[PDB]
PDB file of N, CA and C in Angstrom:
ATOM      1  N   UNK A  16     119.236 149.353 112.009  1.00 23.48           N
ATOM      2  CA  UNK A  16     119.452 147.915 112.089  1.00 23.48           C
ATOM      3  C   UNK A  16     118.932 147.353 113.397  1.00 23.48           C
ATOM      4  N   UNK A  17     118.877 147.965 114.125  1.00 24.06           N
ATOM      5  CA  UNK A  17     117.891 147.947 115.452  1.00 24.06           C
ATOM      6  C   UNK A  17     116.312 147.522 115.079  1.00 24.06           C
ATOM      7  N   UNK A  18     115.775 148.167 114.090  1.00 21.35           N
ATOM      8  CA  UNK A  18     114.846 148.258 114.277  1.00 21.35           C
ATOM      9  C   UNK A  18     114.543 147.122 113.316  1.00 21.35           C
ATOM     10  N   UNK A  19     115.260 146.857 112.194  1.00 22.00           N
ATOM     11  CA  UNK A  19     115.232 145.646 110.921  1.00 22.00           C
ATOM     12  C   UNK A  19     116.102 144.533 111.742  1.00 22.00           C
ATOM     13  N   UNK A  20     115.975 144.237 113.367  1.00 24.90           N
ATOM     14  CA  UNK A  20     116.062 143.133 114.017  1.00 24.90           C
ATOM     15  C   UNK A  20     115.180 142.997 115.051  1.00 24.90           C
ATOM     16  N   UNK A  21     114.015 143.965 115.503  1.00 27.33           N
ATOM     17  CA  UNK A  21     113.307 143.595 116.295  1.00 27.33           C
ATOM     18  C   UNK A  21     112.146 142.604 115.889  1.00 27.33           C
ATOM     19  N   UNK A  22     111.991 142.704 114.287  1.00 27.65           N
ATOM     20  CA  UNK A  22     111.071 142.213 113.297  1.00 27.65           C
ATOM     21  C   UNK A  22     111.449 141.333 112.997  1.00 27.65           C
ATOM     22  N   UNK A  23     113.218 141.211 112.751  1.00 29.93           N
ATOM     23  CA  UNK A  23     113.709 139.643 111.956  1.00 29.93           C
ATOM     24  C   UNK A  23     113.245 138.851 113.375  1.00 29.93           C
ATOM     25  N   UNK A  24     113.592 139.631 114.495  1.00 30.21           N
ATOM     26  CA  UNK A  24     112.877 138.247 115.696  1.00 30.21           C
ATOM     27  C   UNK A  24     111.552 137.573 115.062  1.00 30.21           C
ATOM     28  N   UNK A  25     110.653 138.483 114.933  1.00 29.55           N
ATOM     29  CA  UNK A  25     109.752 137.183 115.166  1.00 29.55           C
ATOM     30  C   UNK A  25     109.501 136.873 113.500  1.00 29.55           C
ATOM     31  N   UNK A  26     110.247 137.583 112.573  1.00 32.31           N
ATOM     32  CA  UNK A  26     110.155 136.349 111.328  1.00 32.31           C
ATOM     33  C   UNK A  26     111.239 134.905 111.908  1.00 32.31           C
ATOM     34  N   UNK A  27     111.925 134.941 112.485  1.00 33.63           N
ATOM     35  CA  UNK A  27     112.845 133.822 113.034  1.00 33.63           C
ATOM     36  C   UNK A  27     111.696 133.028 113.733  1.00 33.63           C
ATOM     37  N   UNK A  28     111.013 133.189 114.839  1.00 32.18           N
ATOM     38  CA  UNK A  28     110.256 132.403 115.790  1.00 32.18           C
ATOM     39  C   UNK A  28     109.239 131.818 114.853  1.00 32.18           C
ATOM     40  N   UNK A  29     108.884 132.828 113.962  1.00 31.98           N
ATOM     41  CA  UNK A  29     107.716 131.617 112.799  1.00 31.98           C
ATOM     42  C   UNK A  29     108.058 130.791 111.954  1.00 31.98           C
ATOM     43  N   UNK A  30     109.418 131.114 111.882  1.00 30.59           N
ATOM     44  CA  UNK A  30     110.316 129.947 111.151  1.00 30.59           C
ATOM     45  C   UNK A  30     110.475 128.473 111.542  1.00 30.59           C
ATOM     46  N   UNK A  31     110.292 128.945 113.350  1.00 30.44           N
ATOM     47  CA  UNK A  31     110.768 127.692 114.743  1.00 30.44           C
ATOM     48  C   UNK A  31     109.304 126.940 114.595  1.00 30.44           C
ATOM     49  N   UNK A  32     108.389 128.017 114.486  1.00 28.82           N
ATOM     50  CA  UNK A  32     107.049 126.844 114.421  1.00 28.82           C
ATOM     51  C   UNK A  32     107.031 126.149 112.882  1.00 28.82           C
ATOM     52  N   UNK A  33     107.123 127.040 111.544  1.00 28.98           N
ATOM     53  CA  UNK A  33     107.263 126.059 110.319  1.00 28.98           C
ATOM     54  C   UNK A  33     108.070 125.153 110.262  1.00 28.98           C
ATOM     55  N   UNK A  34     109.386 125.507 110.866  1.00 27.62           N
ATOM     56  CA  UNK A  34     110.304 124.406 110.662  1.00 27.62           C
ATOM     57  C   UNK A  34     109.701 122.933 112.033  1.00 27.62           C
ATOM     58  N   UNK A  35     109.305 123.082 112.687  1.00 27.35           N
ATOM     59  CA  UNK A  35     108.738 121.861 113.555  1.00 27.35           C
ATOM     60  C   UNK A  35     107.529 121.255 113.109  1.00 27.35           C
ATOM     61  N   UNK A  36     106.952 121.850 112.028  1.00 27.78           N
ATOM     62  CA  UNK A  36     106.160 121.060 111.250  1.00 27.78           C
ATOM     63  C   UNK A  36     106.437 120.221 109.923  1.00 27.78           C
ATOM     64  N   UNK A  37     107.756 120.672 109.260  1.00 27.82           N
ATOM     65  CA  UNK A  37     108.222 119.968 107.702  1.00 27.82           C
ATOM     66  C   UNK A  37     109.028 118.790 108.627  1.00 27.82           C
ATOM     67  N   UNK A  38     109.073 119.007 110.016  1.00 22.24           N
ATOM     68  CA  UNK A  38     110.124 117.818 110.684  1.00 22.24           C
ATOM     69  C   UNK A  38     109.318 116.975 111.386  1.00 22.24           C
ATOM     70  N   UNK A  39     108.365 117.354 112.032  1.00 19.24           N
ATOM     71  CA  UNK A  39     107.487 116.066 113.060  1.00 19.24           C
ATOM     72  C   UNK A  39     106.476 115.460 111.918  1.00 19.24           C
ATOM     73  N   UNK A  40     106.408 116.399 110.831  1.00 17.35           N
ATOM     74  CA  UNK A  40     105.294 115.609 110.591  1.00 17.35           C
ATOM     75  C   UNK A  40     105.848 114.382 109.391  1.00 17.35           C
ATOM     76  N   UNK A  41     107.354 114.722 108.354  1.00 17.30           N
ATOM     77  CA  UNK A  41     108.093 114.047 107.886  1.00 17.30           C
ATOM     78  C   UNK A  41     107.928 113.308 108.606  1.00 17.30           C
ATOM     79  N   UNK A  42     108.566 113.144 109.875  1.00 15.02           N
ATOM     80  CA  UNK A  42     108.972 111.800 110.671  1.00 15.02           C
ATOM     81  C   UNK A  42     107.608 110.980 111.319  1.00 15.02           C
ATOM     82  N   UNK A  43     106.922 111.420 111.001  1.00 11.88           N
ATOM     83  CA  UNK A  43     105.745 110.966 112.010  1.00 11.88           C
ATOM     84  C   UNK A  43     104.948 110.090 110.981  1.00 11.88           C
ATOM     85  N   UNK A  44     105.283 110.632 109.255  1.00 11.65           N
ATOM     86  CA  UNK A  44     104.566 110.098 107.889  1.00 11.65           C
ATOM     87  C   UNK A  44     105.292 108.878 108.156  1.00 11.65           C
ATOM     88  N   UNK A  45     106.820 108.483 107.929  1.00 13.03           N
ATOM     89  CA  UNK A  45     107.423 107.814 107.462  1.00 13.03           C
ATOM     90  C   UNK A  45     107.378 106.401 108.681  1.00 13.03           C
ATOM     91  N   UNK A  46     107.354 106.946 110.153  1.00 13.50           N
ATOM     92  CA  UNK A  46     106.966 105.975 111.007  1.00 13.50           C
ATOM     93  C   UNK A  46     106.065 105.397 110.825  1.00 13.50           C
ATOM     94  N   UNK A  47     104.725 106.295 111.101  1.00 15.70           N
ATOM     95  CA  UNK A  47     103.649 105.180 110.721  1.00 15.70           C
ATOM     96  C   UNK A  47     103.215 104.566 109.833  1.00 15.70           C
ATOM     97  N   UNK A  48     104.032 104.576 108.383  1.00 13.68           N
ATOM     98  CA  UNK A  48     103.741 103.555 107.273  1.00 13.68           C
ATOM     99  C   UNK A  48     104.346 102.518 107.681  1.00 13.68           C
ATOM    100  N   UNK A  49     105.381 102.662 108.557  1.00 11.68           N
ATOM    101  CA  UNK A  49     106.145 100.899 108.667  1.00 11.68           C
ATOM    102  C   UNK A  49     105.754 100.805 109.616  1.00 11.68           C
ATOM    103  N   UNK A  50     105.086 101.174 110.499  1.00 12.33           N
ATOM    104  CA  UNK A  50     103.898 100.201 111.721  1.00 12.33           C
ATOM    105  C   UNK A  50     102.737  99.373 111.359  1.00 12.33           C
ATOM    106  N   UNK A  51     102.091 100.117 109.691  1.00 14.84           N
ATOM    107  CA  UNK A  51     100.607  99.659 109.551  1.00 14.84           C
ATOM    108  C   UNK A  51     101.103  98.271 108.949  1.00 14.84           C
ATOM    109  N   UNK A  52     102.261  98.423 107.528  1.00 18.90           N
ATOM    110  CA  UNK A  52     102.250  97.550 106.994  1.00 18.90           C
ATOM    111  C   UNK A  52     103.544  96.648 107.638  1.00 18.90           C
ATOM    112  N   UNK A  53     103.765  96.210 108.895  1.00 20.10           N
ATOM    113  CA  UNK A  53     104.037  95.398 109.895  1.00 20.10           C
ATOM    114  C   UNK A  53     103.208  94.938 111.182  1.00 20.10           C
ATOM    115  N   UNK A  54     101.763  95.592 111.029  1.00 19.20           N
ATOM    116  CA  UNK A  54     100.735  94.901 111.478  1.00 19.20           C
ATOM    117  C   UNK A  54     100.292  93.997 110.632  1.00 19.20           C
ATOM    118  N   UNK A  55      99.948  94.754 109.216  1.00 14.88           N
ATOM    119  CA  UNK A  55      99.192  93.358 108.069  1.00 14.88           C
ATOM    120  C   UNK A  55     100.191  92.321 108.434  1.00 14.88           C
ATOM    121  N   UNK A  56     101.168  92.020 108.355  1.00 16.39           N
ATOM    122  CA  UNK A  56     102.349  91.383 108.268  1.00 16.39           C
ATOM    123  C   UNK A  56     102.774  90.280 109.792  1.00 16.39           C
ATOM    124  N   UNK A  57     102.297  91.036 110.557  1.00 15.97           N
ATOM    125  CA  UNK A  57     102.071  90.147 112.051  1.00 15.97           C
ATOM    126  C   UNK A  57     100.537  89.425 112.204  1.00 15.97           C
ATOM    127  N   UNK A  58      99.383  90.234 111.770  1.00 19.72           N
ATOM    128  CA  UNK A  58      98.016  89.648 111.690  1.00 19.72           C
ATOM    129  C   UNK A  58      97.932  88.088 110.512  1.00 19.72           C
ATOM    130  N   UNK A  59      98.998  88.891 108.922  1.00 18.74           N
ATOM    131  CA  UNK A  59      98.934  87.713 108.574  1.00 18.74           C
ATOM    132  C   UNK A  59      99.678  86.417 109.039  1.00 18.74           C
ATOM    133  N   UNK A  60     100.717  87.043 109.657  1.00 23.59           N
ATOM    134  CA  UNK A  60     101.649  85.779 110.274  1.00 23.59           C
ATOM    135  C   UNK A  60     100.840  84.466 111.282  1.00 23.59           C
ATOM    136  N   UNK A  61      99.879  85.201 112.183  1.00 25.31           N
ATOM    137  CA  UNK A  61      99.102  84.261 112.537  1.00 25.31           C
ATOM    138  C   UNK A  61      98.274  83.526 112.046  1.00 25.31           C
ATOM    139  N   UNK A  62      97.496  83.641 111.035  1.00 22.88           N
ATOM    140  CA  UNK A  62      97.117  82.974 110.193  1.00 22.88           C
ATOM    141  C   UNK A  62      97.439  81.825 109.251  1.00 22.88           C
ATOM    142  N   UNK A  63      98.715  82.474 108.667  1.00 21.00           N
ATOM    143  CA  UNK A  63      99.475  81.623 107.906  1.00 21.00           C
ATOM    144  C   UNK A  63     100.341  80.605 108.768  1.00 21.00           C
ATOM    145  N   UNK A  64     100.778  80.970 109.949  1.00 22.31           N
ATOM    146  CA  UNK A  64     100.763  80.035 111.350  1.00 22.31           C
ATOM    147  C   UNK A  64     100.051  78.743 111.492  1.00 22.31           C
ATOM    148  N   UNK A  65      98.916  79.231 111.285  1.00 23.37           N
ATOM    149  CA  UNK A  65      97.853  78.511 111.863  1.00 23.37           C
ATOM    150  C   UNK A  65      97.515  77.508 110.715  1.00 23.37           C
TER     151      UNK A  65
ATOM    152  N   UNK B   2     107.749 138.806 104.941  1.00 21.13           N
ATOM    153  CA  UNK B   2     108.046 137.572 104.916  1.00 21.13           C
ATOM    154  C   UNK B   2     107.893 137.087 106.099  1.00 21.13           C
ATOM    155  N   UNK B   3     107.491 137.793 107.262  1.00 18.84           N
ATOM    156  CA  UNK B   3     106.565 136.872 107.951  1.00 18.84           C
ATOM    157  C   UNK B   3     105.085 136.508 108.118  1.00 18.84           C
ATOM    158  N   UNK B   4     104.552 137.452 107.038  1.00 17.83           N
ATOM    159  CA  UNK B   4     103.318 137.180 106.814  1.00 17.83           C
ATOM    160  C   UNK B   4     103.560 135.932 105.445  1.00 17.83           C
ATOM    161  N   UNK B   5     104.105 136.439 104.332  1.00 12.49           N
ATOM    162  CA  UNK B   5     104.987 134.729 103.572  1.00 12.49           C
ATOM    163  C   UNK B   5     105.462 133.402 104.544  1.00 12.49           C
ATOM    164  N   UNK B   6     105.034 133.517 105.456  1.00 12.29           N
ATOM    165  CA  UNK B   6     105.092 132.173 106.446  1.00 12.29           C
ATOM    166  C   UNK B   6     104.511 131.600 107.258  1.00 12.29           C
ATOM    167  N   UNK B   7     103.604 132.704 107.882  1.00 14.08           N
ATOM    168  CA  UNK B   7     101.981 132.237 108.660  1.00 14.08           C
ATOM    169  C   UNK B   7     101.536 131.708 107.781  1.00 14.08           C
ATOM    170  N   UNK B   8     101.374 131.817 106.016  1.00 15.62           N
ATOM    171  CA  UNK B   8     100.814 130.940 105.519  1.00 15.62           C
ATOM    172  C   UNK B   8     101.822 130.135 105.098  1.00 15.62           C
ATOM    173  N   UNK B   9     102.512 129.607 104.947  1.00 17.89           N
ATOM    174  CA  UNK B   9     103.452 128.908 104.395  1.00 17.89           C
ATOM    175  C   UNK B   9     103.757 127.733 105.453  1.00 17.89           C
ATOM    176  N   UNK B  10     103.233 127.804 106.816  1.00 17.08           N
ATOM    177  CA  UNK B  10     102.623 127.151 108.215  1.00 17.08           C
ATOM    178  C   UNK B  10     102.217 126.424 107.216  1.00 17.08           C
ATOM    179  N   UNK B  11     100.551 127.163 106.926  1.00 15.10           N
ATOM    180  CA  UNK B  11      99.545 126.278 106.817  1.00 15.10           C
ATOM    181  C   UNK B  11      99.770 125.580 105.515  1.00 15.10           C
ATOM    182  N   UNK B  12     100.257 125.574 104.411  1.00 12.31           N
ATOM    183  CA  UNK B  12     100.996 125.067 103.177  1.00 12.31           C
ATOM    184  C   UNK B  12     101.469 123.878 103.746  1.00 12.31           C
ATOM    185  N   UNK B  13     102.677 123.953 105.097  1.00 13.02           N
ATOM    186  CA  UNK B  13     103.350 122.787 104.908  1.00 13.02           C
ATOM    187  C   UNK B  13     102.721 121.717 105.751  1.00 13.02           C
ATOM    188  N   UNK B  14     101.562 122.123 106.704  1.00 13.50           N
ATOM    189  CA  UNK B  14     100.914 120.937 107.793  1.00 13.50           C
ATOM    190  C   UNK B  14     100.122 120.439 106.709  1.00 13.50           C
ATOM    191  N   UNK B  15      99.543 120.816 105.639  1.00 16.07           N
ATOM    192  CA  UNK B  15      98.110 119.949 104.654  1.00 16.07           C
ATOM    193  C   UNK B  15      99.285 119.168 103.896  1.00 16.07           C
ATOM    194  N   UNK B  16     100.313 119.503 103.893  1.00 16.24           N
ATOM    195  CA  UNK B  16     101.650 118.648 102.936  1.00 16.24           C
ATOM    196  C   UNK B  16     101.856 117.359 103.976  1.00 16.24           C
ATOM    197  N   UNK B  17     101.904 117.769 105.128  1.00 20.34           N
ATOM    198  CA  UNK B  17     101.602 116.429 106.290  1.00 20.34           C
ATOM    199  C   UNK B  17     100.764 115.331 106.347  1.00 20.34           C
ATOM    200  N   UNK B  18      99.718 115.925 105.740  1.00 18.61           N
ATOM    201  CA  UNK B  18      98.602 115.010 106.079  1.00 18.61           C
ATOM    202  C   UNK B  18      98.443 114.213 104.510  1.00 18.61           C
ATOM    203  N   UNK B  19      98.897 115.319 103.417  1.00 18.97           N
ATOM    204  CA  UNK B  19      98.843 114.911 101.881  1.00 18.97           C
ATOM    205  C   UNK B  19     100.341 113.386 102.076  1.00 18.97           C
ATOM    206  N   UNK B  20     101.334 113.677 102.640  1.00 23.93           N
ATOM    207  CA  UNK B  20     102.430 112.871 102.779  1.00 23.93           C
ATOM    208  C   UNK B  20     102.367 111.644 103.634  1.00 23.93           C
ATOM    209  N   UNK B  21     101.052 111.709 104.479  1.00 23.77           N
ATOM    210  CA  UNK B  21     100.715 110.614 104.962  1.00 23.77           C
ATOM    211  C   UNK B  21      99.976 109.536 104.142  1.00 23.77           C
ATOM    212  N   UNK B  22      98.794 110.178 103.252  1.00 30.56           N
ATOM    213  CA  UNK B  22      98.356 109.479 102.586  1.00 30.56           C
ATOM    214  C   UNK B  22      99.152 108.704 101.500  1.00 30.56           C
ATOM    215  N   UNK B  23     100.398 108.791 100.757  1.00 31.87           N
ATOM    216  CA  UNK B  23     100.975 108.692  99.742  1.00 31.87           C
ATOM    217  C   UNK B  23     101.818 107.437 100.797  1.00 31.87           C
ATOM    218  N   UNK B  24     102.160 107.784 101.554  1.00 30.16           N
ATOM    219  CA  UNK B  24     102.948 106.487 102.606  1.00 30.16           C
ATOM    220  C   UNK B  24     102.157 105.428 103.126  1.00 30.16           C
ATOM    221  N   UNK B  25     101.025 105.617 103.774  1.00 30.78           N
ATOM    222  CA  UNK B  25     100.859 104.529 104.720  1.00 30.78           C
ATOM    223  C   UNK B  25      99.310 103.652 103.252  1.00 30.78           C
ATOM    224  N   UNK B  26      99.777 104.172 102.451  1.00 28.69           N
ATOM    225  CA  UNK B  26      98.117 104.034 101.230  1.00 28.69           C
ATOM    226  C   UNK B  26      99.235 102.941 100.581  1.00 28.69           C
ATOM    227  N   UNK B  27     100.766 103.365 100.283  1.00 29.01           N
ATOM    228  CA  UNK B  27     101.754 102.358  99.601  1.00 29.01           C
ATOM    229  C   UNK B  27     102.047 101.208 100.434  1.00 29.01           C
ATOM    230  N   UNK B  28     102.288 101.733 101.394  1.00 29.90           N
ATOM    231  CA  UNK B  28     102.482 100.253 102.249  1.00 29.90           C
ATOM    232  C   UNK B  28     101.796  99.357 102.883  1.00 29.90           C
ATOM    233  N   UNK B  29     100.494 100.042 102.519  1.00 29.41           N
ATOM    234  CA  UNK B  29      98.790  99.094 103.189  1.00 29.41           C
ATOM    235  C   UNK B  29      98.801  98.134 102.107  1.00 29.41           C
ATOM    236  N   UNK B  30      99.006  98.490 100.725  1.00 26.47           N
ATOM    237  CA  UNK B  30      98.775  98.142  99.630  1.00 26.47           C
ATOM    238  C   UNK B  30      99.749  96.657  99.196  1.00 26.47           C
ATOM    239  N   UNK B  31     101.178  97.208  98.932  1.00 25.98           N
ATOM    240  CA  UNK B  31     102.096  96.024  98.817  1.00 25.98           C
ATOM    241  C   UNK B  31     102.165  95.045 100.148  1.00 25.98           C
ATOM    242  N   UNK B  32     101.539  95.012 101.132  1.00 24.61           N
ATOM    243  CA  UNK B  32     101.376  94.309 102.343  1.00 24.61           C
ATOM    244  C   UNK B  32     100.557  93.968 102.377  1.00 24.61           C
ATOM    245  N   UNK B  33      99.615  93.918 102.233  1.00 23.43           N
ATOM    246  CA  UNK B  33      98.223  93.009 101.432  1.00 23.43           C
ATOM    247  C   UNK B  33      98.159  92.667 100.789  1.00 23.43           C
ATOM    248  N   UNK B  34      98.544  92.870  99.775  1.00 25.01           N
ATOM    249  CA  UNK B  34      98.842  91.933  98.716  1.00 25.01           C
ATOM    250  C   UNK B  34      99.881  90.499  98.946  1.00 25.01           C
ATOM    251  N   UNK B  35     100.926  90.605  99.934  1.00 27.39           N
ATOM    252  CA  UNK B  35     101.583  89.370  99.839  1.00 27.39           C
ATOM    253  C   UNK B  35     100.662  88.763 101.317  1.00 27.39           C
ATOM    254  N   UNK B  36     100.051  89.636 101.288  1.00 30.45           N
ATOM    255  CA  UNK B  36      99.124  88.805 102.706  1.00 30.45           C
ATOM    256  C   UNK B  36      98.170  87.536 101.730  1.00 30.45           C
ATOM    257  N   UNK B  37      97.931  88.231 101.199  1.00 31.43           N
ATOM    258  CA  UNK B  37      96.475  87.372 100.211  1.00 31.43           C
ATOM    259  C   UNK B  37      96.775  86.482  99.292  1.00 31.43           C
ATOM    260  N   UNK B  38      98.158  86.475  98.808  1.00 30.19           N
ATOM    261  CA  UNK B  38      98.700  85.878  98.409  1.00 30.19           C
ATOM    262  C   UNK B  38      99.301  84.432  99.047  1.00 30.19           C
ATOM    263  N   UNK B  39      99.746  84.581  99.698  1.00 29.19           N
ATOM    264  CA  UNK B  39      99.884  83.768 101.315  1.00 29.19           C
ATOM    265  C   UNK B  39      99.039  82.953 101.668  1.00 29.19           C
ATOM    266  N   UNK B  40      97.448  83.342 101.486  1.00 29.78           N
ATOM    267  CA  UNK B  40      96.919  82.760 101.868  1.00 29.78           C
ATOM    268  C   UNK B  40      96.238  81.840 101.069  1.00 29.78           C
ATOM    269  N   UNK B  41      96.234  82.331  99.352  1.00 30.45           N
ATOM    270  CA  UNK B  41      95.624  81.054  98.888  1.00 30.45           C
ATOM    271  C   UNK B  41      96.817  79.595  98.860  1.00 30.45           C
ATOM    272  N   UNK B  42      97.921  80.201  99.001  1.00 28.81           N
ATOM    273  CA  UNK B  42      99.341  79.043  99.090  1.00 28.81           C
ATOM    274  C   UNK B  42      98.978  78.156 100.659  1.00 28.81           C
ATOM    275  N   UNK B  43      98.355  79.208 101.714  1.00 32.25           N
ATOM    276  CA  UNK B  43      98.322  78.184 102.601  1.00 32.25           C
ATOM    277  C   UNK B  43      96.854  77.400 102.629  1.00 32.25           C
ATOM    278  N   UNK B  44      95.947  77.798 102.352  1.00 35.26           N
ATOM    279  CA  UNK B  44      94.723  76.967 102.161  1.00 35.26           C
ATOM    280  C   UNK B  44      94.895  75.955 100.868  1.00 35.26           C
ATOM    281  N   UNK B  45      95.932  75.911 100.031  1.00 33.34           N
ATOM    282  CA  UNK B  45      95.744  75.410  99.029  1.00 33.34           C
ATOM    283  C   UNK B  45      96.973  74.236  99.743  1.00 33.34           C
ATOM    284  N   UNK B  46      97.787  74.337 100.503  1.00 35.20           N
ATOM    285  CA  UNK B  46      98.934  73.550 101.228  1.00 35.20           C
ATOM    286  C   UNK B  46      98.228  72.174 101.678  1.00 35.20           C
ATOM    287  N   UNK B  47      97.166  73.158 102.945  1.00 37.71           N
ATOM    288  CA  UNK B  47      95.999  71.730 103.611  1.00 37.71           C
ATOM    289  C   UNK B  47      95.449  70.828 102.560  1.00 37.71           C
ATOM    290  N   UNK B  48      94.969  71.350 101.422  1.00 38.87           N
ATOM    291  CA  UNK B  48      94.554  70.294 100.467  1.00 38.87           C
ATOM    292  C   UNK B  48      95.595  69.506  99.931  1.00 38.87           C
ATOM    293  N   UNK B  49      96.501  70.228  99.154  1.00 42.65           N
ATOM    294  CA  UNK B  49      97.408  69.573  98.390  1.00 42.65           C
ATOM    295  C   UNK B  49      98.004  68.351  99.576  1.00 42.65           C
ATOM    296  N   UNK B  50      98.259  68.868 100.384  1.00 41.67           N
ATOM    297  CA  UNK B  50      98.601  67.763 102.007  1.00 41.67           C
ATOM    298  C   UNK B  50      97.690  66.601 101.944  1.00 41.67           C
ATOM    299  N   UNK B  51      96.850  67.041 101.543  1.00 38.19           N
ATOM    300  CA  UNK B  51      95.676  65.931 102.434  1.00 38.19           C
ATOM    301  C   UNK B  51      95.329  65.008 100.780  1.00 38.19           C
TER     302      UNK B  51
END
Protein backbone atom coordinates (compact mmCIF):
# COMPACT_ATOMS: atom_id res chain seq x y z
CA UNK A 1 0.00 0.00 0.00
CA UNK A 2 3.10 2.03 0.03
CA UNK A 3 3.76 1.48 -3.13
CA UNK A 4 -0.24 1.72 -4.62
CA UNK A 5 0.25 5.41 -2.96
CA UNK A 6 3.33 6.62 -4.39
CA UNK A 7 1.40 6.35 -7.87
CA UNK A 8 -2.11 7.41 -6.49
CA UNK A 9 0.17 10.74 -5.87
CA UNK A 10 0.57 11.69 -9.05
CA UNK A 11 -2.81 10.19 -10.44
CA UNK A 12 -4.14 12.90 -7.72
CA UNK A 13 -1.81 15.91 -9.09
CA UNK A 14 -3.28 15.19 -12.74
CA UNK A 15 -6.50 15.34 -11.39
CA UNK A 16 -5.36 19.14 -9.82
CA UNK A 17 -4.43 20.10 -13.41
CA UNK A 18 -7.89 18.44 -15.07
CA UNK A 19 -9.87 19.63 -12.48
CA UNK A 20 -8.51 23.52 -13.05
CA UNK A 21 -9.47 23.20 -16.45
CA UNK A 22 -13.50 21.88 -16.29
CA UNK A 23 -13.37 25.08 -13.67
CA UNK A 24 -11.48 28.16 -15.29
CA UNK A 25 -12.54 27.42 -18.37
CA UNK A 26 -16.55 26.87 -17.26
CA UNK A 27 -16.16 30.16 -15.65
CA UNK A 28 -14.26 31.98 -18.10
CA UNK A 29 -17.16 30.54 -21.03
CA UNK A 30 -19.96 31.84 -19.02
CA UNK A 31 -18.23 35.38 -18.22
CA UNK A 32 -17.42 36.27 -21.42
CA UNK A 33 -20.82 35.68 -23.06
CA UNK A 34 -22.32 38.35 -20.74
CA UNK A 35 -19.53 40.89 -21.57
CA UNK A 36 -19.95 40.52 -25.50
CA UNK A 37 -23.65 40.64 -25.45
CA UNK A 38 -23.52 43.81 -22.97
CA UNK A 39 -21.22 45.49 -25.33
CA UNK A 40 -23.83 45.05 -28.39
CA UNK A 41 -26.14 46.41 -25.80
CA UNK A 42 -23.99 49.56 -24.64
CA UNK A 43 -22.76 50.25 -28.49
CA UNK A 44 -26.44 50.00 -29.30
CA UNK A 45 -27.46 52.22 -26.46
CA UNK A 46 -25.56 55.03 -28.02
CA UNK A 47 -27.08 55.02 -30.98
CA UNK A 48 -30.48 54.58 -30.06
CA UNK A 49 -29.44 57.65 -27.70
CA UNK A 50 -28.64 59.53 -30.32
CA UNK B 1 -5.81 5.87 -14.85
CA UNK B 2 -3.37 8.31 -14.99
CA UNK B 3 -2.60 7.80 -18.32
CA UNK B 4 -6.99 7.82 -18.59
CA UNK B 5 -6.37 11.51 -17.69
CA UNK B 6 -3.40 13.06 -19.51
CA UNK B 7 -5.85 12.51 -22.09
CA UNK B 8 -8.91 13.25 -20.53
CA UNK B 9 -6.77 16.92 -19.93
CA UNK B 10 -6.91 17.22 -23.41
CA UNK B 11 -10.81 16.02 -23.84
CA UNK B 12 -11.84 18.58 -21.37
CA UNK B 13 -9.72 22.00 -22.62
CA UNK B 14 -11.29 21.40 -26.60
CA UNK B 15 -14.77 21.09 -24.38
CA UNK B 16 -13.56 24.79 -23.35
CA UNK B 17 -13.18 26.19 -26.34
CA UNK B 18 -16.34 23.91 -27.92
CA UNK B 19 -18.38 25.67 -24.66
CA UNK B 20 -17.30 28.94 -25.62
CA UNK B 21 -18.59 28.83 -28.91
CA UNK B 22 -22.20 27.59 -27.90
CA UNK B 23 -22.21 30.76 -25.28
CA UNK B 24 -20.86 33.80 -26.56
CA UNK B 25 -22.43 32.59 -30.56
CA UNK B 26 -26.10 32.63 -28.26
CA UNK B 27 -25.67 35.75 -26.83
CA UNK B 28 -24.02 37.66 -29.91
CA UNK B 29 -27.08 36.47 -31.58
CA UNK B 30 -30.26 37.37 -29.29
CA UNK B 31 -28.36 40.82 -28.71
CA UNK B 32 -28.35 41.76 -32.12
CA UNK B 33 -31.15 41.06 -32.88
CA UNK B 34 -32.94 43.47 -30.37
CA UNK B 35 -30.13 45.82 -31.44
CA UNK B 36 -31.54 45.92 -35.08
CA UNK B 37 -34.61 45.89 -34.10
CA UNK B 38 -34.20 49.10 -32.14
CA UNK B 39 -33.07 50.59 -34.71
CA UNK B 40 -35.57 50.49 -37.40
CA UNK B 41 -38.14 51.82 -34.31
CA UNK B 42 -35.65 54.59 -33.87
CA UNK B 43 -35.06 55.78 -37.46
CA UNK B 44 -38.60 55.20 -38.12
CA UNK B 45 -39.43 57.57 -34.64
CA UNK B 46 -37.44 60.74 -36.54
CA UNK B 47 -39.84 60.35 -39.38
CA UNK B 48 -42.97 59.45 -37.83
CA UNK B 49 -41.89 62.81 -35.52
CA UNK B 50 -41.31 64.90 -38.24
Amino acid sequence: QSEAEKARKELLELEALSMAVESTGTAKAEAESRAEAARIEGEGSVLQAK
